[PDB]
A = this chain, B = another copy of it.
Amino acid sequence: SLWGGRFAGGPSDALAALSKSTHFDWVLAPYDLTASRAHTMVLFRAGLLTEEQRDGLLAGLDSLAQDVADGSFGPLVTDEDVHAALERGLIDRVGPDLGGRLRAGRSRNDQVAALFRMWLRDAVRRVATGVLDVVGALAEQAAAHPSAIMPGKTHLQSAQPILLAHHLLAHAHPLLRDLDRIVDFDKRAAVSPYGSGALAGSSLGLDPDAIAADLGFSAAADNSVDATAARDFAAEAAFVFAMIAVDLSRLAEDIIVWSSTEFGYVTLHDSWSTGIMPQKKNPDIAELARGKSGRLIGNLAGLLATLKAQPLAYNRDLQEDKEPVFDSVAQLELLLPAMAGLVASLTFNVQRMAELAPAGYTLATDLAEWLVRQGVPFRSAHEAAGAAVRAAEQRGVGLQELTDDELAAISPELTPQVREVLTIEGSVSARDCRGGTAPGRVAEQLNAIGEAAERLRRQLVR
């Protein structure tokens, strides 16, 4: 027998080898046992098992579950999958006779779909926990360094000075939206296929709504062919995982560049890096995060390509649904606490960041801006700024060092009050609308992040 399908003789060596999934699907075991208990209650509530038969199966399953859990029951070298292994194990405990009675009204197709969903619902919550740990590490670094100012980058060129905290937090928001995506995903994942049978619906008079409720689902499927055939929930999980990986790679890239000798923004901790003197530390975790995001994009693209153009209903190609998702989850289970530890382990050189923030006359922008809100038109504000730069460049000073003689000599509009934005402190203070980098704003942002995170966590718990 192979996947409950039958042979006059037996499968060829090469087919037996191709069919095997026990080296990755064993993590489905506990869910499979759960489903079996529920199917026992189904056959009972359908008057298909006596009280002792039901008790006989339930004790069989408990024993089996204990043995699976302690690692003393495993697959033989001949089981194609966890389902065949578990059937064999139950029959060992309860006899061909009683074990066989459980097989009645069972189909592999709705079973496999349901178990994958149950496992996914736990997996996205483990991933959610890792995401929250990274948001947490970012938010605690932001709270620990609420006044450091660094050059804000666009195209890796210095633009406006920003709070380091504001930059850190900018990495948390995509992570919060990924949690929001996990919440939205869970509602679609929470639909049970049990009762769908092979494709056409169960002919035992079972109740798909009750079984759903038994297993943690929020509802039962509306269409048995769809329930057994479709894998868009796996595709959606794969997308959310790739998205998380991509968001981590963006942070990973910052840390990598921040860590270079030339930037010197951060010093890596010895426990969270590898590796000329002790001054040479490699951001290996950040580099792995970068590389693994590629892999998770690949899992997603492969999964979609596997789903494409498949006719209804169940096909054996759908055996390929699990490994890419399992891989994505496993990588993120490794990556998320490594990245959270990395972020938390970081030491920032704020003197280095403060000396770079105003380089190449970036505050000229703040000058021009200041002038615009006096009432100077854009062209004149920007001519005056260019001039003040030229002046400071020829005099070899910073824009702030310019005397009032010179300020007035560039434009009568340039009151000495402009100096309040000609320092990095002052520049950053001016940016005080919602989302801006001013201290008052970033403090409220960090707070809103704590709330959204607790709100998202509570939405997942249900």
Distance in Å from the Cβ of A8 to the closest Cβ of chain B? 5
Is A305 within 8 A of B282, CB to CB?
Answer: no
- Contacts of A361 on B, CB cut-off 8 Å? 276-279
- Answer yes or no: A385 CB below 8 A from chain B CBs: yes
- Answer yes or no: A347 CB below 8 A from chain B CBs: no
A375 closest partner in B (C-beta): B48
Given the known inter-chain contacts A5-B275, A299-B298, A305-B304, please indicate yes or no for A317 contacting B290, CB distance below 8 A.
yes
Given A6-B274, A261-B359, A291-B320, 20 more A-B residue pairs with CB atoms under 8 Å apart are: A8-B279, A12-B271, A48-B372, A100-B377, A109-B154, A154-B314, A155-B315, A158-B276, A160-B198, A166-B224, A174-B232, A201-B433, A201-B441, A250-B307, A276-B386, A278-B362, A291-B317, A293-B306, A293-B308, A295-B303
Which of A12, A46, A272 has the most C-beta atoms of chain B within 10 angstroms of its own C-beta?
A: A12
- Contacts of A340 on B, CB cut-off 8 Å? 14
- Answer yes or no: A62 CB below 8 A from chain B CBs: no
Within 8 A of B (CB), among A1-27: 2-3, 5-12, 14-15, 17-19
Report which of B161, B199, B315 forms a contact with A152, defined as CB distance below 8 A: B199
Distance in Å from the Cβ of A190 to the closest Cβ of chain B? 12
- Looking at the complex, which of A64-72, A180-188, A406-414 is the stretch in contact with chain B? A180-188
- Answer yes or no: A75 CB below 8 A from chain B CBs: no
Within 8 A of B (CB), among A253-281: 253-254, 256-257, 259-264, 270-281
Is B368 within 8 A of A159, CB to CB?
Answer: no
Distance in Å from the Cβ of A128 to the closest Cβ of chain B? 16
Is B311 within 8 A of A308, CB to CB?
Answer: no
Q: How far, in angstroms, from A310 to B248 measured CA to CA in the complex? A: 10
- Answer yes or no: A456 CB below 8 A from chain B CBs: no
Q: How far, in angstroms, from A207 to B335 measured CA to CA in the complex? A: 39
Given the known inter-chain contacts A195-B435, A360-B276, please indicate yes or no for A170 contacting B337, CB distance below 8 A.
no
- Contacts of A161 on B, CB cut-off 8 Å? 200
Is B360 within 8 A of A261, CB to CB?
Answer: yes
Report which of B104, B261, B277 forms a contact with A389, defined as CB distance below 8 A: B277
Is B272 within 8 A of A12, CB to CB?
Answer: yes
A295 closest partner in B (C-beta): B302
- Answer yes or no: A89 CB below 8 A from chain B CBs: no
Is B230 within 8 A of A312, CB to CB?
Answer: no
